[PDB]
Amino acid sequence: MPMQMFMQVYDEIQMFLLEELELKFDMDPNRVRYLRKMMDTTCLGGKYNRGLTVIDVAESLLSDGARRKRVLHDACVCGWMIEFLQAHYLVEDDIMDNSVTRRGKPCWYRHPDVTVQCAINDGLLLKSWTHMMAMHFFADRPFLQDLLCRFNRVDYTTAVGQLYDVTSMFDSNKLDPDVSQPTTTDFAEFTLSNYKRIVKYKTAYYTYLLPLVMGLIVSEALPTVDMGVTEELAMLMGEYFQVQDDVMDCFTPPERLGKVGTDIQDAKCSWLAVTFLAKASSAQVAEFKANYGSGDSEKVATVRRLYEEADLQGDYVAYEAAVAEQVKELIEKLRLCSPGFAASVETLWGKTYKRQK
């Protein structure tokens, strides 16, 4: 069931936005057709984890089926706010990460009839739509203000996180707009500390905290949960998820994943890189520095091999297990006063722990 009504609302939403364009922005049917394809391609075909989580939270907490309908519909709308938000990021990220492929098909910027400049802007329409749907559907809702603030906070934080990511390979001390600079040769910034920061901000907020929050908001239950504990859950779960993403980038075949990995080529401060650099021999570190941040497939393979040789699958297992127990305890801390919420967090973790995506 969750999915049936979700897609039901996708169509309401989509209809509202396109019709609004035609009626109020003087839009010709070609561009309207174009933007429909852009919407479907950029927003559909994922697993909808963030949007579904919102609904799930709404459901779990509603422990006069008219309220039920209102809460569930709102939850769906928030659900798509996040998915459209996600979509926006992904459109821009792929350009920034110079990716080729996404969800089994070419990156939006790589579609044959999509110029790079139009993709950038298509990415922005996407973000605007999150506001547009919110304003329409929640016009007369006493929570729209708070909703919108929180949502802008997360978005900002995500943007900030992306700065961390996109500059993780330059020596921060030499980071000056006026002066050109090459990629770091010493990698002194590839530390777990910096890794954790990138990920907390680029991924944990919008992927884990935000959907929990929006589910609570549409259900008028925000004050009923330990937020400090809710926030730790999200920070932990989101870090692990990003770490999973980093591993898959490297070691999962693109056909399962939907996308070809660029973290090595782009010289990303991935979990692998940082965990590798902290335990590795000088000899290994040296071979790494010699092969990292390069298009060349042999170099890419070498980096992959160093990772295998340094037994990073060792470290991952241990990290994972360590995440799982902290998560288990915090869920129980939350179950004391918040049982319904706590169950949906458990489901969310269910979808994370050992995901094969």
Which residues contribute to the annotated binding site for Mg(2+)?
93-94, 97, 165, 245, 249, 263
Contact indicator for 64, 32 with CB cutoff of 8 Å: no
In terms of phi and psi (left: phi > 0; alpha: psi -120 to 50; beta: otherwise), the region of 347 is alpha
In the 3-class helix/strand/coil scheme, how is 171-184 assigned residue by residue? Answer: CHHHCCCCCCCCCC
> Which of 24-32, 220-228, 276-284, 328-336 is the region at the interface with its own copies (rule: CB under 8 A)?
24-32
DSSP structure class, residue 222: G
The answer to whether residue 141 forms part of the interface with its own copies (CB under 8 A) is no
Residues 197-216 that bind its own copies (CB under 8 A): 197, 200-201
> Which of 193-201, 300-308, 311-319, 322-330 is the region at the interface with its own copies (rule: CB under 8 A)?
193-201
- The amino acid that residue 340 corresponds to is G
The answer to whether residue 251 forms part of the interface with its own copies (CB under 8 A) is no
Q: Residue 125's closest CA among 8, 258, 14, 9?
A: 14
How near is the Cβ of 72 to its own copies at its closest, in Å?
Answer: 24
SS3 102: strand
Question: What CA–CA distance (Å, rounded) separates 117 from 100?
Answer: 17
Question: What CA–CA distance (Å, rounded) separates 111 from 247?
Answer: 27
By a kind-dependent CB cut-off of 5 to 8 A, residue 249 interacts, out of Mg ion, its own copies, none, with Mg ion
Residues 248-287 that bind Mg ion (CB under 5 A): 249
How near is the Cβ of 299 to its own copies at its closest, in Å?
Answer: 21
The answer to whether residue 103 forms part of the interface with its own copies (CB under 8 A) is no
Q: Which is nearer to its own copies, 101 or 167 (CB)?
A: 167
How near is the Cβ of 306 to its own copies at its closest, in Å?
Answer: 26
**Between 156 and 175, how does the x/- string for binding to Mg ion read (CB under 5 A)?**
---------x----------
Q: Which is nearer to its own copies, 5 or 27 (CB)?
A: 27
Residues comprising the chain, all counted: 357
- The amino acid that residue 120 corresponds to is I
By a kind-dependent CB cut-off of 5 to 8 A, residue 25 interacts, out of its own copies, Mg ion, none, with its own copies
Annotated binding residues:
93-94, 97, 165, 245, 249, 263
Alpha-carbon distances of 94 from 86, 163, 170, 248, rounded to whole Å? 12, 14, 20, 16
How near is the Cβ of 204 to its own copies at its closest, in Å?
Answer: 13
Place of tokens 């330059």: 170
> What long-range pairs does 34-37 form, CB within 8 A, spacing at least 24?
35/122, 35/125
Name the pairing type of β-strands 101-102 and 105-106.
Answer: antiparallel
Question: What CA–CA distance (Å, rounded) separates 157 from 225?
Answer: 22
Q: Which of 22, 100, 131, 220 binds its own copies (CB under 8 A)?
A: 131
Contact residues toward its own copies (CB under 8 A) are: 21, 25-28, 30-31, 33-35, 37-38, 41, 92, 95-98, 108, 111-115, 117-118, 120-122, 124-125, 128-129, 131-132, 135, 144-145, 148-149, 152-153, 155-157, 159-160, 162-164, 166-167, 172-173, 175-181, 197, 200-201
